[PDB]
Amino acid sequence: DPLLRTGSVFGGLVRDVRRRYPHYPSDLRDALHSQCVAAVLFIYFAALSPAITFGGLLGEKTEGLMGVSELIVSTAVLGVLFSLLGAQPLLVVGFSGPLLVFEEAFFKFCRAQDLEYLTGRVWVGLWLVVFVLALVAAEGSFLVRYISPFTQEIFAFLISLIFIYETFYKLYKVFTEHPLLPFYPPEPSPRNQPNTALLSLILMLGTFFIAFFLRKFRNSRFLGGKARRIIGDFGIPISILVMVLVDYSITDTYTQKLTVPTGLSVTSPDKRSWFIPPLGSARPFPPWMMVAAAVPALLVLILIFMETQITALIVSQKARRLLKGSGFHLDLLLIGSLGGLCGLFGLPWLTAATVRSVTHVNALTVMRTAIAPGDKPQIQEVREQRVTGVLIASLVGLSIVMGAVLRRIPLAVLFGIFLYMGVTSLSGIQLSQRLLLILMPAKHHPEQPYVTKVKTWRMHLFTCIQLGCIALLWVVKSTAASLAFPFLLLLTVPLRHCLLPRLFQDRELQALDS
Amino acid sequence: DPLLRTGSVFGGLVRDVRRRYPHYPSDLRDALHSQCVAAVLFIYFAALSPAITFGGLLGEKTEGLMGVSELIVSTAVLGVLFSLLGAQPLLVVGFSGPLLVFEEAFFKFCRAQDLEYLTGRVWVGLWLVVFVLALVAAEGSFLVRYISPFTQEIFAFLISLIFIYETFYKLYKVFTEHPLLPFYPPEPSPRNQPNTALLSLILMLGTFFIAFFLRKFRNSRFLGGKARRIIGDFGIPISILVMVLVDYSITDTYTQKLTVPTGLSVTSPDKRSWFIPPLGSARPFPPWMMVAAAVPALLVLILIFMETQITALIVSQKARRLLKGSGFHLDLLLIGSLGGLCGLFGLPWLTAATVRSVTHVNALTVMRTAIAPGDKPQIQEVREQRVTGVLIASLVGLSIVMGAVLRRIPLAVLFGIFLYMGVTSLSGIQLSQRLLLILMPAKHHPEQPYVTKVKTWRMHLFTCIQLGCIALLWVVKSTAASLAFPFLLLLTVPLRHCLLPRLFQDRELQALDS
């Protein structure tokens, strides 16, 4: 019962510490295996590229005040600290879309009022630190017990759908940069090149299909058990290596490659330094802004709390076989304090990444070798350790000095990898199966508890409601009112507790929503 | 059984006629279904393109004496006649590689000795007619009873392997014609074009994968039974239509398309006419060649007999549920007489086509709708009729006036179709399963009669022997001694009946070989 209220100050935190910290030698010792290396290699590429993409976007939005080097430094430091001191070291911290929305809105507001951007960020971070400390000291992390699987499925489905859409849009942009023309006259990024878009499509699809086939090969009957396990563990590194070698063989055509800034330097050395004075560098900071920086701190707190807590709820479900424990108090305090303190040095804030954390958990899941003939395998265990997170964060930080190796890797391979992650993440969602049940004939539905106890037309209404919520949230995100997306999602918690009982019966809701 | 020796002249022929001809109204009536249209559409493209390819090759080899129009006329006429009067109307007649080898060798010999090519062909055809009549009159089509599944499996495996290899070589030649260059300076088929090779690869792979996925969709669990069964039948027409539309959408890039000669005319109107005088046109034909034309007639007879009889043996196996009967005497007489008479008009000879006939049988197989959960579907029936063969032959003959529609179809779609046919044809061979059993561990082998009654190391020696025979036949075929290919295959019939019993026992041979 980690969500019970004790009535003492900092009670949940000491309970989490006493529950988790004794397992520390076990956490260090469980990492001696071959699956950990494959997980590290997969998640390193899964985590590095969004840093580069969002760093480029942030540098475009904030006129070079924050770029790629700042985001890389923040990701590395926060990831290392969270993995070392966290109660759930299987979570991956990183940047996200709502954070970018908040940063661009705050930059516009600061430029409108003739204020320094980084000083406002400093005071916002300090207010956020105060708010997180006050919330944790009041054991306020028990409200998570009101977050039903309704909102969890909605959140996971929306996030994975957006991930897949963005990957496809990135692929499409190549075809507009490099169109297929009749004549290519002979001649600062290259533009209007021949054989560039089609090769990119081929590389992306090849990587995706090789990874998917190698994943299917694990449950087959060919070869020995050990060879099957080893090949199944290393499917994605093998796909990446094969497609990179294939692309390297063709040396006549232009393809875009990974570019990482060289050296540990601030993006604009003339405009700013690594430390931001809290009282002002060029002008004195007005006290009224220092007082009034609380509202953006409240928005950031709501965003971070929602994302981190929903990710921790999804990751630690009972069907996923998590044993060492879960922390709903220590993780929030760690993330809030580190994010608030990051404002002093002009680094962006971070939160727990959902798809990356789910993929990290999946890459360490060990299934039963004694697969029943013609039956889906069941989860045997999950490897719990702290080495993988520290290694991934260290590699992300160290990528600055390894630009030479990273320069040989095309982006279409990573597009295929991201497609694989997005497609795989949607298979652990019950809404996915309840959506597949729409196509099957009414006599073909399986024996799940939501099938026997509910009529079909009363099971499809729940799915329609969830899909309507997902569509409305996507529409809200796409328009100019995206800054209110974290709030609207939290509005689906009253709906399941005040309105759904008025339509459904308690017995139906017990089986459908569980 | 139809393979017994009655002891009377023409006994087998009258037995075949009396067994098969009473079913004629049922043969005409069984064609009223939707599956027949899909089979016609698939096999029409499967049969038309080899006519064009071999017509081009023959026109190259024979210096324009025989080309594409002659091959099309021969295919149409012989197919219509065989389908109308045959005892096994599920066989498809057409040109093949050994026939091309024979024509090239005979042209070289006629050129060396200063003889007319077409008059020699005329006398060869007459001798072939005489030989076939003499062979059928002595009920000599009973030796087929000595052809064990050893030879049948070897033949089928070799033919399908060669088919797949030729498709891949065609794609490679497409790439070599249009290399990937850095600069494409603007300047008789087009050469050195941009975006042509990669688009061809994409079209081929897309067609193959769409067809394969739609074939898998048949045994699925979604939608109604009627929709599933309609979509499963029309998978290949749907693939072709989708990829043709996709290729038509892109109007910037060059792709090669189907080219069919216009009009019913001889390839070289100056050199020859439609009728070849048997006594000589420009010079008198020496009588010594008229006598000595028997040896090439013997070679052609051996080739046609071997190919047709092995194809009929493979098609009419007991596992395929053939009910209306089989023809081993009428088919040989029909093919031999028509081929021999074709020499008078300067048209090439024909034989039964193995992959095309197997594909034609597969396209008309109906499985049980009551598929057991997690079980292989069972063959319910095969639709026997004569309408499909007549329609396919008529369409092949009529493709001369339909060049406008045919000119909008790229060749990469057909490459994907041929890959699908070749891959599908190798799944009905027991050697394929016995070759897959090498990879599996010895404890996962199935309960087939060749697994329980034979030791594991004793059933791999049989597979190694068969594979060695296949490799030796391929090597012999590729070299300059290819004219001896039909003989060497017939040398595998003594091997099973004279040397194999000296190593294996009666029980092992009975279990391994049917």
Author numbering:
A (entry chain A), B (entry chain B): 673 to 859, 884 to 1210
Q: What's the publication's text?
A:
The structure of hAE3 in the presence of HCO3− and HCO3−/DIDS, and without HCO3− supplementation were determined with C2 symmetry, reaching overall resolutions of 2.7 Å, 2.7 Å, and 2.9 Å, respectively. In general, human AE3 adopts a homodimeric state, and each protomer is composed of a transmembrane domain (TMD) and an N-terminal cytoplasmic domain (NTD), the latter remaining unresolved in all three cryo-EM structures. In all three cryo-EM structures, hAE3 TMD consistently adopts an outward-facing conformation, demonstrating a high degree of structural conservation compared to human AE1 and AE2 in their respective outward-facing conformations. In TMDs, the cryo-EM density map was fragmentary for residues 860–883 in the extracellular loop at the dimeric interface and twenty-two residues of the C-terminal loop, and thus left unmodeled. In the AE3 TMD structures, the dimerization of hAE3 is primarily facilitated by hydrophobic interactions between the transmembrane helices TMH6 of the two protomers. Key residues oppositely arranged at the dimeric interface, including L894, I898, F905, and F909, form hydrophobic pairs that contribute significantly to the stability of the dimer. Notably, the contacts between the TMDs of hAE3 protomers are relatively sparse. Attempts to capture AE3 in its inward-facing state, similar to the methods used in resolving the full-length structure of AE227, including varying pHs and anions in cryo-EM sample preparation, did not yield alternative conformations of AE3. The inward-facing state of AE3 is suggested to be relatively unstable and transient, as inferred from the dominance of the outward-facing conformation in EM observations.
